[PDB]
Design an enzyme around this catalytic site. Structure first.
Site, mmCIF file in Angstrom:
data_model
loop_
_atom_site.group_PDB
_atom_site.id
_atom_site.type_symbol
_atom_site.label_atom_id
_atom_site.label_comp_id
_atom_site.label_asym_id
_atom_site.label_seq_id
_atom_site.Cartn_x
_atom_site.Cartn_y
_atom_site.Cartn_z
ATOM 1 N N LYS A 1 12.060 51.258 -15.312
ATOM 2 C CA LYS A 1 13.541 51.207 -15.134
ATOM 3 C C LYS A 1 14.106 51.042 -16.536
ATOM 4 O O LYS A 1 13.495 50.314 -17.342
ATOM 5 C CB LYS A 1 13.951 50.098 -14.158
ATOM 6 N N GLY A 2 15.181 51.741 -16.853
ATOM 7 C CA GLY A 2 15.744 51.778 -18.210
ATOM 8 C C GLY A 2 17.142 52.359 -18.197
ATOM 9 O O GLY A 2 17.680 52.626 -17.086
ATOM 10 N N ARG A 3 17.670 52.623 -19.387
ATOM 11 C CA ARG A 3 18.961 53.330 -19.561
ATOM 12 C C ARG A 3 18.763 54.773 -19.057
ATOM 13 O O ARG A 3 19.736 55.341 -18.582
ATOM 14 C CB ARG A 3 19.423 53.224 -21.026
ATOM 15 N N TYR A 4 17.564 55.356 -19.197
ATOM 16 C CA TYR A 4 17.243 56.755 -18.778
ATOM 17 C C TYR A 4 17.309 56.939 -17.253
ATOM 18 O O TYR A 4 17.393 58.120 -16.780
ATOM 19 C CB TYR A 4 15.816 57.171 -19.165
ATOM 20 C CG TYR A 4 14.734 56.268 -18.629
ATOM 21 C CD1 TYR A 4 14.148 56.504 -17.395
ATOM 22 C CD2 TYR A 4 14.285 55.179 -19.358
ATOM 23 C CE1 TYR A 4 13.161 55.677 -16.898
ATOM 24 C CE2 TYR A 4 13.296 54.339 -18.873
ATOM 25 C CZ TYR A 4 12.729 54.599 -17.639
ATOM 26 O OH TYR A 4 11.760 53.792 -17.157
ATOM 27 N N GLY A 5 17.242 55.864 -16.480
ATOM 28 C CA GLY A 5 17.064 55.929 -15.021
ATOM 29 C C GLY A 5 15.852 55.163 -14.572
ATOM 30 O O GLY A 5 15.678 54.026 -15.075
ATOM 31 N N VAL B 1 11.438 55.584 -13.229
ATOM 32 C CA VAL B 1 10.230 56.360 -12.833
ATOM 33 C C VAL B 1 9.569 55.693 -11.635
ATOM 34 O O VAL B 1 9.375 54.453 -11.694
ATOM 35 C CB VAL B 1 9.241 56.580 -13.985
ATOM 36 C CG1 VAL B 1 8.043 57.418 -13.509
ATOM 37 C CG2 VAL B 1 9.938 57.207 -15.160
ATOM 38 N N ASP C 1 11.116 62.593 -30.216
ATOM 39 C CA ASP C 1 11.124 61.166 -29.814
ATOM 40 C C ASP C 1 9.711 60.631 -29.601
ATOM 41 O O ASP C 1 9.419 60.022 -28.580
ATOM 42 C CB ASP C 1 12.092 60.926 -28.641
ATOM 43 C CG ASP C 1 12.429 59.444 -28.434
ATOM 44 O OD1 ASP C 1 12.247 58.634 -29.342
ATOM 45 O OD2 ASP C 1 12.923 59.127 -27.334
HETATM 46 C C1 LU8 Z 1 7.419 58.457 -20.779
HETATM 47 O O1 LU8 Z 1 7.906 59.486 -19.877
HETATM 48 C C2 LU8 Z 1 7.422 59.615 -18.566
HETATM 49 C C3 LU8 Z 1 6.334 58.901 -18.021
HETATM 50 C C4 LU8 Z 1 5.946 59.135 -16.684
HETATM 51 C C5 LU8 Z 1 4.773 58.387 -16.079
HETATM 52 C C6 LU8 Z 1 3.704 59.173 -15.666
HETATM 53 N N1 LU8 Z 1 2.604 58.618 -15.110
HETATM 54 C C7 LU8 Z 1 2.542 57.297 -14.940
HETATM 55 C C8 LU8 Z 1 3.577 56.431 -15.328
HETATM 56 C C9 LU8 Z 1 3.293 54.942 -15.073
HETATM 57 C C10 LU8 Z 1 2.563 54.528 -13.955
HETATM 58 C C11 LU8 Z 1 2.238 53.170 -13.753
HETATM 59 C C12 LU8 Z 1 2.662 52.190 -14.644
HETATM 60 C C13 LU8 Z 1 2.376 50.712 -14.514
HETATM 61 C C14 LU8 Z 1 2.255 50.217 -13.081
HETATM 62 C C15 LU8 Z 1 2.031 48.706 -13.136
HETATM 63 N N2 LU8 Z 1 0.765 48.431 -13.852
HETATM 64 C C16 LU8 Z 1 -0.416 48.887 -13.086
HETATM 65 C C17 LU8 Z 1 0.762 48.904 -15.253
HETATM 66 C C18 LU8 Z 1 1.117 50.389 -15.319
HETATM 67 C C19 LU8 Z 1 3.379 52.593 -15.731
HETATM 68 C C20 LU8 Z 1 3.667 53.950 -15.958
HETATM 69 C C21 LU8 Z 1 4.731 57.003 -15.891
HETATM 70 C C22 LU8 Z 1 5.914 56.156 -16.278
HETATM 71 C C23 LU8 Z 1 6.633 60.072 -15.946
HETATM 72 C C24 LU8 Z 1 7.721 60.761 -16.488
HETATM 73 O O2 LU8 Z 1 8.463 61.690 -15.792
HETATM 74 C C25 LU8 Z 1 8.176 61.942 -14.407
HETATM 75 C C26 LU8 Z 1 8.132 60.510 -17.790
HETATM 76 O O3 LU8 Z 1 9.199 61.188 -18.334
HETATM 77 C C27 LU8 Z 1 9.041 62.489 -18.780
#
Ligand code: LU8
Ligand code: LU8
Ligand code: LU8
Ligand code: LU8
Lengths: 292, 284
Positions: free
Chosen positions: B15-19, B21, B134
């Site tokens: 969760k962030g300024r971007y929205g 995931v 970025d």
């Molecule tokens: C930077 O950007 C983007 C990233 C992602 C993305 C892709 N896979 C997995 C993740 C993720 C999953 C799980 C955790 C946590 C869960 C709690 N604990 C277990 C530690 C880990 C964190 C992160 C993300 C955030 C998708 C995006 O777009 C759909 C993004 O933007 C382009």
């Protein structure tokens, strides 16, 4: 609920395909774009991002998707479904009375003025491919304009013109003189509005031909049917519109009917070679609102 | 045919300024769903425009699945759907985890591989050259096979501003040659060198490791201002500290040299992503 069922193909062309589908138990239209037209999909998506685009006389947006696995991409547009089909289809085997003819043309003018006029929000928008295949007929006897893939946007408050990135050109039969002779001023928003006015006049002519007066009606024909080859090229159209200075002929039986006499005057004011002489969409809407 | 579009959103992983995931489920399969804030709509448009131009497919690029726009009563909803990486971001991963020589090298060579794939123009129907704009450890995901992939093409340029902590000197002093595509590659290389430093600190040698810290943690505040960064990077010409303990370890000695050659003030002196790959393949 996001799932859709594709039920039947209602159109196939160089553009891709359109399907009647089912979504939350209702008919929707699903357009699957050809690879060739990927820049139209993206432009139409930019246009439908605008919440204040929504209008009675603009094809209603449900969703847009780009999907991919491996090296394959699919491009989807999901809209409201109009089972009566396009105005082109409708005019082939229906004639009109005065009331129906004016309702159709006023509704298209209403849609086009809504596109052209900025809301302070929705930018000013020029369509660039107005034609009877890009207008759908609705059960309330009004029409709605479709296909915003070539559209241009302008914002007066910020002096911003967005011509998009799309090498597609308008449908050759409906191209204004300045498009066919390639002298159009590409950095001028008003130039694009004036191209839409030209095409609107052609659609007015196609419709008015099908309005009965004094027991007489013309058969459906597309603009310039009499003077160009089937499947006319860019140069075929440039010859008749720019070299030969041709405009659609007004059938003399129109001059016995006050409504068709008024419509003939209006379409002639859409067809000046000087684009700045052409009527505005708002003026066309006001004129049609007064005609009976 | 049935077009199954339903995605079950199971848990918010960012969760962030971007929205936001979300981890989601399509047809039994994990996907990641980025739901854009109104603040960040243009990032959805730019990434979607890039993927409509070139369907990037690379081991070290986050895998595209879909761009979705849905009409709501009063708003437009924008989703980007990608592969899901359960280990999360490299930023997340480095907080707890320490590395050995083999893991550290596999991480940094995989990032260099992704970055060189973005940067390189390939002729035929190929890809345009792409600069990320970025690059940072939050925009890199860790995969179970030990490699990483680069995420977030919302600021990418083909041939919102970047995160200020990672801005090159020419961005901070507004001397960047904006009409020169190579300028944007050189800004990514700078950022790559900072990510290299972040990872190297977490590599154990002779029983010693540094705690995770972001670049410039000792000289700027949290959420540093543009001016805070300009004074450090441009006026005083500071660079991240290389600890003495690195010079006892041949891998960290080589990595210190590499990161120095990503941080030259003169952008045209910096190494290319392809040269960084070659150097990394000859370490160890
Ligand atoms: C930077 O950007 C983007 C990233 C992602 C993305 C892709 N896979 C997995 C993740 C993720 C999953 C799980 C955790 C946590 C869960 C709690 N604990 C277990 C530690 C880990 C964190 C992160 C993300 C955030 C998708 C995006 O777009 C759909 C993004 O933007 C382009
Ligand atoms: C968006 O993403 C995913 C999509 C799909 C998926 C579902 N139905 C059909 C398809 C498909 C079939 C056939 C062709 C081609 C084959 C050769 N030529 C004739 C052109 C047509 C393309 C596509 C796919 C790829 C599955 C996925 O995972 C299992 C996806 O990933 C989440
Ligand atoms: C112009 O552009 C778009 C149009 C549409 C669209 C929406 N409702 C209905 C239709 C349709 C249905 C049926 C027939 C005919 C079929 C054979 N016969 C003549 C009887 C009936 C014609 C037309 C269409 C084609 C959707 C689009 O996108 C999803 C369009 O693209 C923006
Ligand atoms: C619209 O939206 C979403 C769609 C999907 C999705 C679901 N089932 C099947 C498909 C599919 C793929 C590819 C073809 C090919 C097969 C025939 N070939 C000759 C041309 C076309 C057909 C069907 C898709 C793309 C998933 C989504 O989310 C993961 C969607 O929402 C973003």
């Amino acid at each position: 609920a996001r799932d859709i069922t594709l039920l039947e193909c209602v159109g196939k062309g160089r553009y891709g395909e359109v399907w009647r589908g089912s979504w939350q138990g209702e008919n929707v239209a699903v357009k699957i774009f050809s690879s060739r037209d990927e820049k139209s999909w993206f432009r139409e998506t930019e246009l439908y991002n605008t919440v204040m685009l929504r209008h009675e006389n603009i094809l209603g947006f449900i969703a847009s998707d780009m999907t991919s696995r491996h090296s394959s991409t699919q491009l989807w547009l999901i809209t409201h479904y109009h089972e009566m089909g396009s105005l082109y289809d409708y005019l082939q085997l229906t004639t009109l009375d005065t009331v129906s003819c004016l309702r159709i043309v006023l509704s298209i003018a209403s849609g086009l003025a809504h596109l052209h006029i900025e809301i302070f929000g929705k930018p000013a928008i020029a369509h660039r491919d107005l034609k009877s295949k890009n207008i759908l007929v609705k059960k309330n006897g009004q029409c709605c304009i479709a296909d915003l893939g070539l559209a241009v946007m302008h914002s007066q408050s910020t002096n911003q013109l967005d011509v998009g990135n799309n090498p597609r050109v308008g449908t050759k039969r409906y191209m204004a003189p300045e498009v066919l002779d390639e002298t159009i001023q590409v950095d001028c928003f008003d130039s694009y509005k004036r191209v839409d006015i030209w095409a609107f006049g052609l659609v007015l002519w196609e419709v008015a031909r099908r309005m009965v007066s004094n027991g007489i009606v013309e058969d459906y024909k597309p603009p310039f049917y009499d003077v160009v080859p089937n499947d006319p090229s860019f140069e075929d159209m440039r010859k008749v519109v720019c070299v030969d200075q041709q405009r659609p002929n007004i059938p003399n039986r129109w001059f016995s009917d006050p409504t068709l006499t008024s419509l003939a005057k209006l379409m002639k004011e859409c067809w000046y070679q000087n684009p700045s002489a052409r009527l505005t969409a708002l003026r066309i809407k006001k004129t049609l609102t007064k005609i009976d």
